[PDB]
Structure formats: C-alpha cells, structure tokens
Design a protein around this ligand. Structure first.
Ligand SMILES: Cc1cc2nc3c(=O)[nH]c(=O)nc-3n(C[C@H](O)[C@H](O)[C@H](O)COP(=O)(O)OP(=O)(O)OC[C@H]3O[C@@H](n4cnc5c(N)ncnc54)[C@H](O)[C@@H]3O)c2cc1C
Ligand SMILES: Cc1cc2nc3c(=O)[nH]c(=O)nc-3n(C[C@H](O)[C@H](O)[C@H](O)COP(=O)(O)OP(=O)(O)OC[C@H]3O[C@@H](n4cnc5c(N)ncnc54)[C@H](O)[C@@H]3O)c2cc1C
Ligand SMILES: NC(=O)c1ccc[n+]([C@@H]2O[C@H](COP(=O)([O-])OP(=O)(O)OC[C@H]3O[C@@H](n4cnc5c(N)ncnc54)[C@H](OP(=O)(O)O)[C@@H]3O)[C@@H](O)[C@H]2O)c1
Ligand SMILES: NC(=O)c1ccc[n+]([C@@H]2O[C@H](COP(=O)([O-])OP(=O)(O)OC[C@H]3O[C@@H](n4cnc5c(N)ncnc54)[C@H](OP(=O)(O)O)[C@@H]3O)[C@@H](O)[C@H]2O)c1
Lengths: 446, 446
C-alpha cells in the first residue's frame, strides 16, 4: 500500500509519472501516486503565462518563458527515447520548434499514458517533513480551488520543482533612482513592449543571448549587453554592443567599467536563478549553485541524508528532457526495490568521484560530454531504451558551431533524429521573419 | 520566562514592540520578545524598494509603494498619541508628507524606544504550528543572512504581516496576446516609465486614483480608467476618462462594455489585495475579504479559535497608525494578564454585534465613524493616551470634501493636529509641481 508524492508536473514530474506508468504497462505492480502542481495545467516552464511576479493565488509565478521563445538547442537532443517526434506529430518538422510546439509534444506523451489522473492541479506544496518514528513524510499543501490546507502521508517523495524560477537579482548602485523599468529575465513577457527602445541586458549567458535576440527581432532601437567576466563573443547585429560590466545608474543613464555611459530605457537583469525550496527544512533542502554536478545527490538524484527523498533535474541542463527521463526511471527503480542503494559511505565516495571529474571540465564540448556520460551511466541500469549518446554529443557540437558561425541564424539549420534516423526539413520561414510563434503557424506551411 | 513572537516589523510590528516597551518603561515586567522581519529594515510598506515580484532571497517582494507616493489622508489622522509630529521633526510641516517623510517618523518612535534589538531582520517566517500537548507555538523561520532554517518555541504569537502585499490579479480575455506591459498596482515603481504613453488603469479605489495621478503628474500622454460597479466620479484632467469595465484586449487595444475601444500601451491592474498567510494552517489562518470588520477576531484582534494568537491591522484602513497602536496595546494587555478574555461564546456574540453594525454602513462618513467607535472602545481599556476621535472623524470629513472639490489639489490643504492643537502650514510647493519626493526637499524650503 506503499505511497509516492511527486512535487511538480513539469517535464520532470511528467517524466516521473510516465516512468511508473511504463513499468505498470509491462505488468509490474506500482506504488500509489499523488503529484501536486501549483499551476492549473502541466508543462512547467513550457506552460506560458502572461502573469508576472505573483500568480492568481499569490504563489510566486513559476514560468520564466516569454512570447516568441523557441527551442534553444536541437530538438534532436531533447527527444524522448520512448515517444518520438515522428509519433507525436505524424510528419517531419524543423529542428528548433517554438514553445507551444514543444509544450504540445511533452503533453502528448503524458496524454497517451493517461497519467493526468494522478495530479492535483492548483495545489501548492507548503511543507514536507520527515517523521522519524513512522519513517514517512508528511506533505502539507494548499488547495487553491477549495482554499484548504491539508496534509497527507507518503513513503517516498520525488521533488521536481525546478531551479530556473526563483530569480537571482543582484543590486546595482542607483536602481532606486532610475526612471525606466527594471526587471529580471524571469519577468520578460512580450518583446513588443521594448519596440523603439534602448534596452540594457545585464549578463552573458542564454537569457542574455535570447532576450536580446527577441528585442532585436521585434524592433528595439538598440541593445547594450554587459558582462561580468568575459564577453559572449558573438558577432551581433549593428544596433547591439557588448560592454564590460554595469557599475551604476542614475535617472536615465547607465555607466560601465568601460568609462562609457549612455541613455537607457529599460534594464533587464539576465543574471540567472537560485535553487530555492521554501517547503523543505535543512534535513531535506538541497543547497547548490547551478552546475553539472550538485553535491549530495547519489547518481545525481538520491538525497544522501535521507535516501527516501529524490530530486529530478536539479543539474544545469545541456541535455534536458531525456536526462529527466533517465533520472526518473532510475528513481522509479530505486523506489520499486529493483536497484538497492549502497551504504552511505559508498554513495559519498561515488559522488565525490563525480565532483572531481566535474572540476576538470573546461570546454563546452567536455561539459555536455560529461552530462552524456552521466546519462549513459543512468540508462544502462534501467529498461529505459538506450540511444546514441556520442551521436547526441556530435549534434550538440554542430549546434555550437552554428551559433559561432552566426548567432542570429543558428535556428535555421537542421539535424537528424537519433531515435528515428530521419533528417529534419528546413523550416518554411527563416527565423528572423517568423514573427508568429503559434503551433498552428509553425505546423501548417505559409 | 514567558515568550512572544511578533511577525513583521512594519507599523504594526513596530507598534507591538512599542506597546511592550512602554509598559516596561512604566515599571512593569514584560515577556521576552522576538520579532521576525523578512526585509533588511523596518517600516513595512513604507520601506521603498525598486524590486518587483520576488526579492533577493526569493521571498515575495513586500512593499507596494512607488516613487512620489505621498500620504493619502491628513497626517493629522494618523499621528501617534504618544509621539507627536512636533516632537519628531521639531517644527510644523504640511498635512500630506511624502513616503520618505512618514517612514522617517515611524522609525523615529521606535528608535527612541530602543526596540530594534528585539528584531531579527532578513528572516522569513515559514510556518507557525500550535502544539496541543505543551500549549505553545513552534515558529519556523529562514535566516537569509546565514541561509539556515530553524525554529523556536513561543507562548503567544502576534501576526503583523499586513494585507496589502499579495495582489488580487483578475484575468481578462486576451491578456496572453497583448503587446504592452501588464502589471498589478503592486509592481508599479517609477511613473516616468509611462511618460508619453497611454495607460489603462483597471479599478476604481485608492490605487486607481493615486497611480493615475502620478502617471498624469509625470507626463503620461493619456489615461483610461475603467470601473466594475460605479465610477470613481471625480472631475479628472482633460487627458483622463472613466469608462465602464474592460472586457477584452488584443495585440494593441482594449475593449470596454461601453462598446468603445482604443490603443493602449500598458495595463495596470489596480484591483486590490488578498489576505494571504502562507505560513499558517487552517487552525490559525484568517480568511477574509478586505473590510471594516473581519470575522473571528475578538475586539478585532484576538483569534477566536486560539486566543493565544493575535492579528494586528487586518481591517481595512481609514485610520491606520493609531489604530494599530490601539490594537497593539490591547493585545499587550491581554498577553500580560491585565485584561482576561471572556468565554468563547461571549467573544462570538460580541463579534457578531460588531458585524451586524458593519453591515448597516452606507456612507464614507458612517464608515470611518465606525472605525473610530471601534478605536474608542479599544483605547478606553488601556493606558493608551485617549484623544479626540470625533474631531478626527471631522478631519476625515474635510478631507473627503477636499477630494470631491478637486481630486488633483486635495493635498494642498492643511488641518490641525488633534494631539497638539497646532494648525499645519501650507507646503512650500503645490502638489502638481513638487516633482522631487525626497525627505530633504520636503523639509527644507523652495
Ligand atoms: C526561459 C527558459 C527557457 C528554456 N528553454 C529551454 C529549451 O529551449 N530547451 C531545453 O532543453 N530547456 C530549456 N529550458 C530548461 C528547462 O529547465 C527545461 O526545459 C525543463 O522545463 C525542466 O523542467 P522541470 O520539470 O524539471 O522543471 P520546471 O519545468 O520548472 O517545472 C517545475 C514544476 O514544478 C512546479 N512547482 C514548483 N514549486 C511548486 C510548489 N511549491 N507546489 C507545487 N508545484 C510546484 C511548477 O509549477 C512547475 O510546473 C528553459 C528554461 C527557461 C527558464
Ligand atoms: C501602496 C500603499 C500606500 C499606502 N499609503 C497609506 C497612506 O498614505 N496612509 C495610511 O494611513 N496608510 C497607507 N497605506 C496602508 C498601510 O496598510 C498602512 O499605512 C501600514 O503600512 C500598515 O502596516 P502593517 O505593519 O500592518 O503592515 P505592513 O506595513 O505591510 O508591514 C508588514 C510587515 O510584515 C513583514 N512580513 C510579511 N510576511 C512576512 C514573513 N513571512 N516573514 C517575515 N516578515 C514578513 C513585511 O516585510 C512587512 O515589513 C498604504 C498601503 C499601500 C499598499
Ligand atoms: N530558449 C532559450 O533560448 C533560453 C532562454 C533563457 C534560458 N534558457 C535556459 O536557462 C538556463 C540558463 O538561463 P540564464 O542565462 O538566465 O542563467 P545562467 O545560465 O546561470 O547565467 C547567469 C548569467 O548571469 C550573469 N551574472 C550573474 N551575476 C551577475 C552580476 N552580479 N553582474 C553581471 N552579470 C551577472 C552570469 O555572469 P558570469 O558569466 O560572470 O557567471 C551569467 O552570464 C540555460 O541552461 C537554458 O536551458 C533557455
Ligand atoms: N498613498 C495612497 O494614495 C495609496 C495608494 C494605493 C493604496 N493605498 C491604500 O491601500 C488601500 C486600498 O488599495 P486598493 O485601491 O489597491 O484596493 P481596494 O481599496 O480594495 O479596491 C479594490 C478595487 O479594485 C476593483 N476591482 C476588483 N476586481 C475587479 C475586476 N475584476 N475588474 C475591475 N475592477 C476590479 C474593485 O472594484 P469594485 O469597487 O467594483 O469592488 C475596487 O475598485 C487603501 O485603504 C489605502 O490605505 C493608498
């Protein structure tokens, strides 16, 4: 009568449900499942909302996604080994689908699987405690539909609440006096809000690349992006420059370590996120910066201090969807008794070996290869379909080259699926001109 | 060795500490105090921040206040009976001080009292449980300076976390397609962000009045405000009209029940707040809409289901600072044994009588007079200095008339202090021209 709690119904929660459902379909007897989700529908980040800051129930808004967002890597690198792009759409499609298209895809797997019935939507997880005496977890949640706080007992808990939602938002001198809008990447919604405007983007990783690109694409007057350590280093459009870092601000201007300075309408902090778990105490709470190998997680997923608690997708992401699968399948097999955990000492020693290797990594290539090795090790222990990881590494490599070649057109290239073998078609419209981000617009043919 | 927890160091928390400190100064022996505050300094709403949505630790941003905010009622109606405006500033000042000026004042009382030492700043209250077996509260908090979650036992808890922070944010058809900024009043920061723009304000209470006024004052091209029930009904500037309710929106336009419609750059939801206490379970959690008499609070402050738990300032606010005092002094005397509570049945019957009367109220005059009667009933039970409530009522009445006379110049009038008798000077600058909101600018003379 063993009972499991899954926190969150994004890709990771969906993957954990899907892993149990698959074991059950092959005839295994599975635990009882309850998955709690604070939004009204599944998909995690991929469920777009116009809302900003706090949602209609007062929970922090979860999604950081914006209008016009498109896959940032090759779809071929994030394809499910058990539910192909061919199966879901019935036809080839280009390699960088818009948000709505990938949303549709991940829902499709879990619609086929019938796992929606396990999910209590509109329910925020408030608190998870472990009771020593009974060896079980009390999960306290708030049901916003009924406006009730209640709690329930579980034998295992799988946490899938992500780490790209709680913004890291550093302060800069003068922000209290600046007259334009200051916002974090997290609150970016429609690029059209910045048409004909000068937009400062603080930071130099994916958010900066892509939020700049959208502002450019939808007609901002000018873009300044500044970096803390090293410049992003791509060849930008003519109305976009990189400066060394922002140092202060006044009523209208920004000042850089350059010595330069200029008039700026809006500042967008593209400074990343914190791992933040307001519902866990120190006995259960993961503390880490964003990285390929957070400590304290055996095989990157079992909580070393209480191996009945698990974390999915808490690593930085080169791979994503099929990493979460590998992780969710491993957790499932641990929970189900198919893969007994070693002692605490051996877990720590294993994790340390993973951390030593992580610290070796210099180049982007070495990094996704490392995540690949990690994933390889996971999928080899479970009935998760194996797939060509070295060939996925190669596809990441091409993608890197395409971005270096030209940062504004990398989305116009195509790659071959490592599940099906088929090469993807070019898209009916080049990126810069595809102004409509809808599923409908992308799947027809204008 | 009796121990009290005070949740929040805004005006209410500050009042609660001040109430204890005064009893102690007069020679009483007081309980031990710990006050928890998630911000880095005291003042509550009055502590301005440029931050929006979630703060640097990932907590919801608390303050709803914006640049250029000024007192919305006569300072004479919110004067402390035990720490006058004369005492704090050393000289007369006008009747509608800017935010920074009132912040300075409320901090002044609590700096004089030396109560800062009781407060653990940068600490978010996560959870408050009541243990039946020991009859005490476990308060769990997260210290963001040390990044540690810990908990502590208390005999009484006073909740002062406010109810104008978690926004009520209704959805309107088309919001997911609109191309400008959508925001709640709560996120409104610098009016200059809307200079030369058309701004729709949804709502018809104080937020709508005042945010519109600031947008106007700082040079917005045009203002549309729309109402759900009745229009605000003031004579607005020429570039500002009131329409019946908003019904939908597309890429660039708003459509109203008017039948009318127009191009709009930014939508500001001025639709109020919810009472939200994510750190309480249903045994302790107050559930109410914003009103003069929330139910379940004996004398408006003692939690009827567990009278060792208290709420300060959870009523809607005509009076404010000296209401919180009256309430804090009452809670103090209850906690200290000077005012024993009646049985549960009598509390309920008393609360019912207050509710019946609340439901009687029609006119704005009847409403603040009701709050005044409530405050009268409180201050008569404690050593809180009594003061002229009927004369404060009269002052509110004048203020109402000044607003109806001209909504854009009500802040240029002056009233007499009910603590000192002295009439307040006119201000060195009329409202529409005082563009600088700083303490310094308001307290010197230009
Ligand atoms: C702007 C942005 C763009 C991205 N684009 C890509 C991309 O193009 N390609 C790619 O591979 N990856 C991308 N990512 C990476 C992203 O992390 C993954 O794609 C994927 O969404 C990870 O999903 P997850 O389920 O682990 O967490 P999430 O997707 O964040 O979902 C977590 C779920 O947990 C829920 N939750 C959180 N707290 C609670 C609580 N208290 N109670 C109940 N429920 C809770 C949330 O509501 C949410 O549904 C992007 C990330 C961001 C932020
Ligand atoms: C925009 C705006 C303008 C206003 N203008 C006026 C005015 O001009 N005149 C007037 O009389 N009234 C005004 N008010 C009314 C306001 O409610 C009172 O003036 C007063 O600030 C109420 O104080 P409070 O201490 O009860 O709550 P607050 O002032 O809101 O302070 C609550 C405190 O609780 C803390 N807190 C909340 N949650 C936690 C947690 N979980 N853990 C730790 N700490 C927590 C917050 O950090 C905050 O410091 C205004 C309100 C708003 C929103
Ligand atoms: N579809 C898309 O294209 C898309 C868009 C956004 C996000 N994402 C996803 O989200 C993940 C990362 O998002 P992210 O770019 O927001 O965070 P991130 O990858 O951790 O990058 C954080 C960035 O902010 C900078 N930064 C931090 N503090 C700073 C400071 N005080 N001053 C100046 N700069 C500062 C960092 O500077 P330093 O470099 O000096 O450390 C770094 O460039 C990616 O793995 C991707 O999956 C995808
Ligand atoms: N210094 C200042 O001037 C200042 C500024 C802001 C706030 N404050 C303080 O904050 C308190 C109130 O702030 P508030 O005005 O934001 O909230 P509020 O007083 O409760 O008013 C809520 C408003 O939003 C409207 N509304 C709610 N739902 C709506 C919907 N679905 N569609 C359209 N309109 C809708 C309500 O409509 P209905 O009228 O139909 O009920 C009402 O006008 C005041 O007591 C004051 O202390 C002061």
């Amino acid at each position: 009568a063993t009972r499991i709690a899954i926190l969150g119904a994004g890709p990771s929660g969906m993957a954990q449900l899907r892993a149990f459902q698959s074991a059950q379909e092959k005839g295994a007897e599975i635990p009882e499942l309850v998955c709690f989700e604070k939004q009204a529908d599944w998909g995690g980040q991929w469920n777009y909302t116009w809302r900003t800051g706090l949602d209609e129930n007062g929970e922090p808004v979860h999604s950081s996604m914006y209008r016009y967002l498109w896959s940032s890597g090759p779809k071929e690198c994030l394809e499910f080994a058990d539910y192909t792009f061919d199966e879901h759409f019935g036809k080839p499609i280009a390699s960088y689908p818009p948000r709505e298209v990938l949303w549709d895809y991940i829902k499709g797997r879990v619609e086929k699987a019938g796992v929606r019935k396990y999910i209590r939507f509109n329910t925020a997880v408030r608190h998870v405690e472990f009771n020593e005496d009974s060896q079980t977890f009390t999960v306290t949640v708030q049901d916003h539909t009924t406006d009730t706080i209640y709690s329930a007992a579980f034998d295992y808990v799988v946490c899938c609440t992500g780490h790209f939602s709680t913004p890291y938002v550093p302060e800069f001198e003068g922000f209290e006096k600046f007259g334009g809008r200051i916002l974090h990447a997290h609150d970016f919604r429609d690029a059209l809000e910045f048409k004909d405007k000068t937009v400062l983007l603080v930071g130099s990783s994916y958010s900066a690349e892509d939020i700049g690109s959208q502002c450019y694409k939808y007609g901002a007057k000018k873009l300044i992006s500044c970096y803390r350590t090293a410049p992003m280093g791509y060849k930008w459009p003519e109305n976009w420059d990189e400066r060394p870092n922002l140092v202060r601000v006044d009523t209208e201007n920004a000042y850089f370590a350059d010595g330069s300075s200029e008039k700026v309408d809006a500042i967008i902090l593209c400074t990343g996120y914190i791992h933040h778990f307001p519902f866990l105490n120190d006995d259960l709470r993961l503390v880490t910066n964003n990285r390929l190998w957070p400590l304290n997680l055996y095989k990157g997923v079992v909580w070393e201090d209480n191996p009945k608690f698990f974390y999915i997708g808490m690593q930085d992401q080169w791979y994503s969807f099929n990493m979460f699968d590998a992780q969710a399948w491993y957790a499932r097999d641990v929970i189900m008794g198919r893969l007994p955990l070693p002692s605490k000492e051996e877990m720590k020693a294993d994790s340390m070996a993973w951390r030593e290797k992580e610290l070796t990594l210099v180049t982007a290539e070495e990094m996704y290869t490392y995540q690949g090795d990690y994933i390889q090790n996971l999928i080899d222990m479970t009935d998760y379909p194996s797939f060509d990881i070295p060939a996925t590494n190669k596809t990441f490599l091409e993608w890197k080259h395409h971005k270096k070649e030209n940062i504004m057109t990398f989305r116009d290239h195509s790659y071959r699926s490592l599940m099906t073998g088929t090469m993807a078609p070019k898209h009916h419209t080049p990126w810069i001109d595809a102004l409509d981000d809808s599923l409908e617009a992308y799947l027809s043919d204008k």
